[PDB]
Amino acid sequence: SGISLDNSYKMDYPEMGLCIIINNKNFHKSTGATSRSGTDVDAANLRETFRNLKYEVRNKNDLTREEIVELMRDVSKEDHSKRSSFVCVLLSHGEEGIIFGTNGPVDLKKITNFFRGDRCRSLTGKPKLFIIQACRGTELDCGIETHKIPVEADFLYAYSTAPGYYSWRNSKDGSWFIQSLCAMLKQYADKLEFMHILTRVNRKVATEFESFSFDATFHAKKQIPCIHSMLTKELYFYHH
């Protein structure tokens, strides 16, 4: 045939792939973690959004840390040969490097390690997207007025917030990040490359949201999401 280019991931496998959504709203009393009002709005928005992208969506609610690890291990042992990609969305409490099960924290690296290029062979060379709505620390942004491959290759972490910072969730509307992500996917998934979609998400969160709190410490604060890309190709959700 004629000249061929390989700058973009092959996304025309028989299936787009799994979208695992872990929605942790209610936490064991002994953890002292607050209920995450608004997260069901996020989970429903994500389900619809990724449904329209032709992902096989599996929603899981209120998993313990043991259940999260087992779920991830089991999913990583599935045969993904006919799937183009893998998506996992984590909605929970967190710290830097950490996501909360209902009964306590799990290392993010433990979860993602199951999908390493050497450990999940049917996803080797395919994009593995981890979308994370969770805090990464306790900083607040005051704002300003205006032939081998690496086993860590082909991962993308779409973090809701900058390293070290809280992440914001509205109890009625859902989280700022997931709200914005779903809106930008809806509008641009049939026309923009994924990093450019996520950049529009960055702008939306950065410009259209500001916290309101009766507590001066938490009032009038801002958020910027952080794209962490170790992808090796452009990613378009459409093909042909």
Binding site: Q133, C135, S160, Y166, R169, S211, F212, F218
Partner: peptide
């Protein structure tokens, strides 16, 4: 508005 709440933090995660």
């Amino acid at each position: 508005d709440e933090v995660d």
